C-alpha cells in the first residue's frame, strides 16, 4: 500500500524536523536572504574568525577550527542518534546492532547533511549564525586544508541533485539501516526495515521528482560514494591524530572511530 509508504515518508519527515534544527530549507532561506533576520557573520580569515568568536561560540587557527568541527560533529551524532530512534523498527533491534549501525552510519550522514548547509562559497555554522568561506577553510595549513575541502567537493555534486528535506529524511534513514555494516548480529530485521524504507524512498522520488527518473538510482550510488569518502576521511584523521602533537579528539569521536576496521 502506497498510503502506508507515504505515511512513513511523512513520519520520517516530521521526525527529521524535530531532530535537526537547521534544515536545508531554513539553510537556503538564510543563504538567499529570504529571512530578514540578521545575516550570518562571515568568517573569511584569521582576523574575522577572532571577531566572530562570540557569535559562533555559545592554539593556532588550523587546530582551532578542526576542534570546532569536532564539537559540531559530536552534536550532530546526538541529533542523528535521536532521528535514528524515530525510524520505525530501530529501537526494537538488538542494542549492539543499534550501536554498530550508528558507529558506521553517522559520518556518512554528517557528510550528507553538511551539503544542506553549503554552497560553492562556504558553509553555514552555529545554526546559521555564522558562515565560513570555503577558501579560508581549504587554505588552512595541511593536512587541515585537505581535511575540509573534500566535504565541499561532495556537497557541490550532491546539491546538484536538488533534494529537499523530505527526500533527505528517507535517504538518511535508508543509510542508517544498512544491513551490511561490519559486525551486525541480526541482519534480517535490518534488511527488512531497509527494504521498506527503500520502497518509500523510490515512491517519494517518483512523486516529488517526476522529471528526474534517475534520481533513485543516483542516490543509491551516493550511498556507496559516502563509504569511500568516509574511509578516506578516517584515514585522513589517523594521520592528524598522530602527527599533530596537540590534538585532543573528543571522547565520542574516539568511540566511533575506535576499531572502525
Amino acid at each position: 500500500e502506497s498510503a502506508d509508504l507515504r505515511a512513513l515518508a511523512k513520519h520520517l519527515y516530521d521526525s527529521y524536523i524535530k531532530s535537526f534544527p537547521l534544515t536545508k530549507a531554513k539553510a537556503r532561506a538564510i543563504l538567499t536572504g529570504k529571512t530578514t533576520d540578521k545575516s550570518p557573520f562571515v568568517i573569511y580569515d584569521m582576523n574575522s574568525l577572532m571577531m566572530g568568536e562570540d557569535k559562533i561560540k555559545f592554539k593556532e587557527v588550523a587546530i582551532r577550527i578542526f576542534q570546532g568541527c569536532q564539537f559540531r560533529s559530536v552534536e550532530a551524532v546526538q541529533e542523528i542518534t535521536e532521528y535514528a530512534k524515530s525510524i520505525p523498527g530501530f529501537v526494537n533491534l538488538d542494542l549492539n546492532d543499534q550501536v554498530t549501525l550508528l558507529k558506521y552510519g553517522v559520518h556518512e550522514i554528517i557528510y550528507t547533511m553538511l551539503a544542506s548547509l553549503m554552497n560553492k562559497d562556504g558553509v553555514l555554522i552555529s545554526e546559521g549564525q555564522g558562515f565560513m568561506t570555503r577558501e579560508f577553510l581549504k587554505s588552512l595549513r595541511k593536512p587541515f586544508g585537505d581535511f575540509m575541502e573534500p566535504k565541499f567537493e561532495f556537497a557541490v555534486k550532491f546539491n546538484a541533485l536538488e533534494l529537499d528535506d523530505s527526500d533527505l529524511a528517507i535517504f538518511i534513514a535508508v543509510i542508517i539501516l544498512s544491513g551490511d555494516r561490519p559486525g551486525l548480529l541480526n541482519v534480517k530485521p535490518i534488511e527488512d526495515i531497509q527494504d521498506n524504507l527503500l520502497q518509500a524512498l523510490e515512491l517519494q522520488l517518483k512523486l516529488n521528482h517526476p522529471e528526474s527518473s534517475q534520481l533513485f538510482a543516483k542516490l543509491l550510488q551516493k550511498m556507496t560514494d559516502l563509504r569511500q569518502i568516509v574511509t578516506e576521511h578516517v584515514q585522513l584523521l589517523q594521520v592528524i591524530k598522530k602527527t599533530e602533537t596537540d590534538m585532543s579528539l573528543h571522547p565520542l569521536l574516539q568511540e566511533i572511530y575506535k576499531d572502525l576496521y
Binding site: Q78, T81, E82, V91, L95, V99, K103, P251, L252, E255
Partner: peptide
C-alpha cells in the same frame, strides 16, 4: 566500549 552511544540509545 561505546558507552556513550549506549547511553544515547537508551536515553
Amino acid at each position: 566500549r561505546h558507552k556513550i552511544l549506549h547511553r544515547l540509545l537508551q536515553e
